[PDB]
């Protein structure tokens, strides 16, 4: 009866105040973690300290299709799933010229192909249910404009973007709405004026983008479809003109 | 304990506006209604605003004829002495070939969907800007601020521009913290199909096949007005129903 | 012979755009604020070349009046195939006390004017039923803000807007309309490498590489050109706060 | 020295076209084909009856990185580069749910993979050479919009659409522009018809040449200040919403 969230990445950052947050508006939540386990049981504990259900998993999506599995294994641990939140990992740099084959291939695996196998397990346990769902993946202001010597980083972000679309387009038939939120600058785990490159001059607090995929995961957001929501503090505003 | 924060939001007497004005309140905002000639809509709002004890004030507003009409924006202010939101939300489309445009009409349009909000959000920010608290400024544009609208150039140009207002506010007022982003909403549903609930299947060019509940914008609108949204400045969210997704490979 | 109207053609993009008009086979109409003398030595280079060439003052400060010179220009040739519209200069005004005139004067400038001049060239290519093209000088600026010049931006926003309205609604007509976004323009004495490093090229642009894409979407190979805003700008867009020059 | 210009994919199509269209401006061709070799001697053909050398080599995208050493290849037949183009190859449709995941890869094996390789090899000469560059990518109006059914090559188009931003700005110091150009419905080569796509708004597909064209620009020297951009051509499909009514 009650509606279950899976978020992947969980276990620290953005991906652990989503699924907080998704327990304040009353989800189940699926926990996901890479190796960060106890950060994960932190999650779960205060998940459950909210009064709701917690289920952990290991899932590795750096090894494709296999890694992709747990996500089959969480829902039958709840016997339904409404809302996927498909969480991003690090960003690495690497020149343009000299980069690995591997190394390019290797941030597609992490940052579009991980996330395509997760949708597609959620989306057909959402379709066979006939109650709608939501989808939501989180990308990266580099989603739409350059992240310099992170050519791999920017394309595979542009890729989830297109992935959103598309998926949003025919999973409209079955009421799946799927959006993407595309964060600027995140604070670290560890954390005023100290990025002037910004207009807001700062990185954006966790809380200040896992509001807004708790927005998009809500009963309020069922108009809203094929997006990509960009919490930046301005950054996309600031162009060669800008001067801090 | 803290001093209650006021939203202004304009054309509240009935639709978007009207449904944003009650999300504000239940969130403890304050509101400032405004009403261009339906007054008994507006004191609807404000009875439905009073009933969850908050304070409601209410103004005749004439974004028709400028600059006079904008200054109803510095009485609201006047009676709640502070200002820590503005919603410009959007008058009516009218539609115009544009061939046989006069330039009077096409001048009109731009007068009551960017002259008007420009000159609300210049009194809202100068007011925001002398409390140094911060503030929001959230402007309702339309999907059609990003693709044509046929038979509504004007409307379009209008929208258009609006969304370029929206991002040079946001980035001239970003140091005094005041943050500018816009709704831009598809097809909404006329009062009489928004209150009666469930209108599916109604619009299959659409690919949710349905104009959207005002509820579904102003919720939106609400989040882009509190704390939460305190990293979200320049953008235009669009809440369409997949209208931007349908181009002429979509089959309905 | 076609006939190509550029406003503002006295110097700068429009100059350049009538001159590369007339070496792709145009009659060229030629637009001037004040500098006469200037529109009559591009006339005159146009005539070198074989086409003819047409001057009349236009000031689209005051309309519609101002416009109506559209009009008297196309009698003079009987045929209007190309309306080029030229972007006039930027002005900056902070936006919490800009005055509402100013407001309102650059909207009438920036995008009135090309809209009534649009009106009435669109106006003649529908009567002669052989189509034409329509490209809208708008900016940058059309999609990115500038600072302390919001009612620019809003402006070239607008212009943006109407472009992609005027070519849905002309589409059945063959009437062809664009935009071209140009990035920083060289002043006519330079028209350098590293006078502009926030802009990645860290140079302006010479008026024949905004003019050339312009004369490209009038000719015959832009036919399945419409409702699109071609930025020319040194990669202008590119750079965000990540980028360090 | 006459300038080089590899286009990959011109043994018909938008491919065969561009190169006409570059070897008119006076470029020196380089021909790549996946399984048509007798369609790129006929490229190379038409190419040397403009006045122009053509040189045609094996190019196997399903088969990477080994397969894209053929640019290499063709460059040192030539010795010099000067421009690229990456030309797309075919589109194939399959449903998102049940699509399955090597078939998801393969697409963007053939439509991103392949031209990251070419451009790395293509842009590493024209910086030994230090006498600039022009990189050009094909995408689609998908680059932008979503087709359906084709979710992995609208997401590879978008990748695609990201990659070239991203060359543009590591690039732009050695004077190497890298551009996009988004076509929209191509017309088959049978016929390369007014009124037979009432859904789009020029209501017809275009012509090869009416992309080729703005290519071929993108490549010449007028082009000098555009890097970085997406230039759609497309008859007005992006114009297309659901308000829009076919006359």
């Known amino acids: 009866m009650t509606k279950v969230a899976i978020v992947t990445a969980s276990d620290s950052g ?17 926990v996901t973690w890479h190796s960060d386990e106890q950060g994960a049981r932190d999650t779960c504990r205060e998940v459950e300290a909210q009064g709701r259900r917690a ?42 010229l000299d980069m690995p084959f591997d190394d390019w291939r290797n941030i597609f695996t992490v940052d579009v192909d991980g996330a395509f196998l997760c949708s597609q397990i959620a989306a057909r346990k959402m379709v066979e ?31 989830l973007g297109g992935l959103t679309k598309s998926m949003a387009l025919e999973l409209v038939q079955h009421n799946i709405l799927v959006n993407a939120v595309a964060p600027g600058a995140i604070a670290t785990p560890m954390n005023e004026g100290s990025m002037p490159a910004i207009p807001l001059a700062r990185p954006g607090y966790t809380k200040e983008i896992a509001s807004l995929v708790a927005w998009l995961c809500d ?13 930046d503090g301005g950054f996309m505003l600031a162009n060669p003109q800008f001067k801090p």
């Open 219 to 231: 009963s309020d957001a069922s108009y809203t479809t094929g997006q990509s929501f960009i919490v």
């Open 129 to 159: 249910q006939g109650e709608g769902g939501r989808i939501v993946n989180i990308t990266s202001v580099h989603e739409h404009t350059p992240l310099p010597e992170a050519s791999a980083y920017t394309a595979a972000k542009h890729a």
């Open 14 to 30: 953005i991906g652990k105040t989503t699924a907080l947050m998704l327990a304040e508006r009353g989800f189940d939540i699926g």
């Open 55 to 96: 289920e952990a998993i290991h899932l590795d999506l750096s090894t494709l299709p296999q890694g992709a599995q747990a996500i089959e294994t969480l829902i039958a641990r709840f016997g339904r799933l409404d809302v996927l939140v498909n969480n991003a990992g690090a960003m690495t740099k690497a020149p343009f």
